[PDB]
Design a protein around this nucleic acid. Sequence first.
RNA 1: GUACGUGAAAUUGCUGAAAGGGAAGCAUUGGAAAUCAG
RNA 2: UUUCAAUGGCCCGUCUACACGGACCAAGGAGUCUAGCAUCUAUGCGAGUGUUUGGGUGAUGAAAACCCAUCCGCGAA
RNA 3: CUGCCGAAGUUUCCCUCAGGAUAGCAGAAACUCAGAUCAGUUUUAUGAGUAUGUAAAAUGAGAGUUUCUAGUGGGCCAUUUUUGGUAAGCAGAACUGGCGAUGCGGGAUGAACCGAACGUGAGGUUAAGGUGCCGGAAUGUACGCUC
RNA 4: GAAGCUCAGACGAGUAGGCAGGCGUGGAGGUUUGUGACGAAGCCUUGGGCGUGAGCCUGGGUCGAACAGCCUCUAGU
Lengths: 94, 217, 133, 51, 123, 118
Amino acid sequence: PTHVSKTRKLRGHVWRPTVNLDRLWTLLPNEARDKYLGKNTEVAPVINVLQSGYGKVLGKGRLPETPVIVQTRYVSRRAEEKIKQAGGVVELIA
Amino acid sequence: VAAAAEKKSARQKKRELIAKRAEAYEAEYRAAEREQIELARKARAEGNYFVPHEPKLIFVVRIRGINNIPPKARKIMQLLRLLQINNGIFVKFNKAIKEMLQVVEPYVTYGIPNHKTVRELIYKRGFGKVNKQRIPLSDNAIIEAALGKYSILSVEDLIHEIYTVGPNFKQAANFLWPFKLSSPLGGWRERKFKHFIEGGDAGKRDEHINGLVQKML
Amino acid sequence: RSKPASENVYLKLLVKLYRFLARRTDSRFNKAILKRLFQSKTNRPPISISKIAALTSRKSASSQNKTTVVVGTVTDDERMLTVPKLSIAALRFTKSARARILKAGGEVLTLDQLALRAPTGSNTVLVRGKKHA
Amino acid sequence: AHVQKKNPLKNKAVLSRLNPYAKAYKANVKINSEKTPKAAGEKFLSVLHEN
Amino acid sequence: QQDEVIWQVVGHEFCSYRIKGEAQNFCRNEYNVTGLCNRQSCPLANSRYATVREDNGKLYLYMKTIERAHFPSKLWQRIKLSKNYAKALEQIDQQLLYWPGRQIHRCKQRLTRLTQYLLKARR
Amino acid sequence: VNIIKKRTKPFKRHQSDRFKRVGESWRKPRGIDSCVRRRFRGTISMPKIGYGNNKKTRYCMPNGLKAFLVRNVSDVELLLMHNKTYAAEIAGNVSARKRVEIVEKARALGVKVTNAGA
RNA sequence: GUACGUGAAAUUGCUGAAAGGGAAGCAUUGGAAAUCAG
RNA sequence: UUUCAAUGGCCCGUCUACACGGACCAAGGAGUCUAGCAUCUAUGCGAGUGUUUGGGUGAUGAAAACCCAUCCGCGAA
RNA sequence: CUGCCGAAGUUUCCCUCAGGAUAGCAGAAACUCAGAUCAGUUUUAUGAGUAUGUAAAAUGAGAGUUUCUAGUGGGCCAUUUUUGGUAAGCAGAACUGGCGAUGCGGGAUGAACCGAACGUGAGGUUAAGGUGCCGGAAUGUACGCUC
RNA sequence: GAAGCUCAGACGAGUAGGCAGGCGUGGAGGUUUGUGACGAAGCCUUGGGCGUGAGCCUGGGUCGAACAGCCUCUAGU
């Protein structure tokens, strides 16, 4: 818009995306979280970070104590132990 | 009938209180003037010399404009609240004030007023600084609101607090706005910007400042 | 400042309501909101459900039923999966945050609702969003 | 309030408002009389009429 | 939605019954009495009010109700006065005694000017 | 309350009389050395906010009535509640038939018409 | 009226009015003459 | 409105007293569009965000509107 | 078109260059304490040899900030110091104000002299300078000098 | 006409520059049952009125077909 401009007032005056453990439980479908988080079930949920375009699973954050299997290409050196006491397992994608 | 009744009675009793106060102050002025006369007469008779009294109150009037003034002097003007020609302010005459005044000696005139000029000023040209506003003193309630903490309840109490230099002299300035005086009737002297002793009009002038105010006022 | 720079009529109603509350009561809470409702968008940072939950259940708690008040946006934090029962008043809640409060928790309020509830702002915590951005 | 500023010195009604004392102020008072005690020290006359 | 948001939309800037000039604005709306645009007298923005307007030798009145205000056909009802200027005045103040009185001083004054028409029209 | 005008003469543009290309309408002198810009003694005056008239008597005809432009019968019909404040002004491009219709309506409302003699 | 719708200014002529002894133009205040207005 | 009297009034613009431009009038006539970047304000959404490269639909007006597809960009380290 | 706010000429250094800087000023947004929190100011005490500083009484004012961002970075005039100086001026620095952006009264007239810092008016009173006439205002009063 | 009403006080030069509110022009969307051959726009005018101003309304004459107010958009303003 020229009418608001200053000229109309001067007239005359001259590859590896990263995911941390505070976010794995957000990658599930919400019904999977509803029916699998916190329930003492024999079978544990499985998370494939690669299906969300994530290469390496870093370990920042706390975890719920529900066991969960995480499938990943690469993993940070603490991210695996935190899921040990979380009761779930980590196994490595080829 | 009630509510307003007790307010009127308290209003009434306050009216006699300032009446009683005013009587006390007037007796104080007359007694002070009398002993001045008697101690002068007695000393002059028996022979020994009486001496004047170092004054603590003087009235100051700025007589030069706002152009061509050194930065040292205009700074003093700001600290004195003399920011305009033909203004006027009171200052507690002491060593700090006296030594301050000679800096602006050619730019102000100062001297010791007596009770009449104080009373005339407040009544006629007395404007009170209420809430950072130049509010005239048309009522005693105006002064009560701003000086009730210091037990000053009327114009006459303010006049005594000023003229006799009470402890609340400092606690009365920011209640009172500078006296914006008119140009003096009859004029100044022929050469206004010489020292008063030299036939001019600037500087300390004592018993001949009362005259000036009557004109300026 | 003396008026908000937005043209939102609903925001101007809040300003109209809280001008009255500030100038007809002595509550400094109402004055605080009025000063913060005049603020620009980047001076009103968001707040998170995680932050509010931490700020309520903090140290000696002392939150109880005190309704949390913030003048801004209350965004969600997916990093938390356990959301406590909360009572929150704000200009606007993101869709995810509103659902997470309602489905498992307490209530969401707008600022006009808060005035009808606690016009003096009694028993409220007046949080503010992180200005570091 | 106070549309116009009135001088107590000229408007007598405004004095009655400001001073509940101008009713009886009694400016002039006989404090002399027939009996004036002229008193100027004798040596004060000597030093005055000196040189 | 509500009456303030309606006022904030139509009242301030755009209405078909509003007339701006050099620095003044009037409300032509047939249901306003003072004829000028404000929140207290806005026809579109506010709830039930009362007005009167001329027709071929008589005056007649507009009102609203709150329950029926969603149905514009009978949102307004019309009552007719064609007997006398004075009797119109007593009628008008009567039908607004049980109603807020902030409008009568404008309403009752409007009448006599409309009736003054008929006299001047006759002359 | 009498209507008061601080100034009656208009502010003519500098040298608007020595040239036919420089117009009567006021223009602010921009030149740094303009004796009119520096407001020398004897030079023409410049519009200032100090000449603004009283808000109570501003926009009022010499008889204390404000002008309202009227183009059809509807406009004057809207003036019935201000017959004491606003005087109607028939627009220039209103036909002869409408002018007599408006003016007769305005007479019925008792509202002042400034140019009824047309 | 084909030098063709409207026909501005610069510019020229005629009539009327007024002023003018080495300029004028402009501004403020009024008088006079003309002309309006409520 | 004209004119008279008294009083005052150096020709304007530009540069740095000048000087340089100006015979008069009319029309035209000079900070524009676009890309990047930055601040600020406003609006929408919010750990997300952005569908107009593309597909569907719109025939009664169709270069619009509306719907769908997030490969991807920026952000989340 | 009107209104409002409104500097700078020298700083802060930096530079190859013109410049920027950087301030300062003017601002624009956020946030402390109702304070000894300040000051182109004075005073008192205090050491050292009226001034000096520090600390504190007077005095006026609400006093701080961190952040980004326009324009300016000249010169002239006079005062005070001031070494080289000569028929005589002249040169050298440092400082101060005024001027640039400033109209008005006065000095016959004038970039700086004397007063005075400006919205539209009415009335009153003055500054500087004047009161024979031009010219508003005493061909005033008093005492002398001068042909 | 809360973007409103009301009371009080102080203040008013201004270059570069900073900020705010307005006047005017061509075209677009919306609205005013808007104006008009019983004379639109334009043009003239010792006619009148309004605004501090940019400018605006109107009387009379000439003229002969289109034009404007308001809220927004826009720019070869």
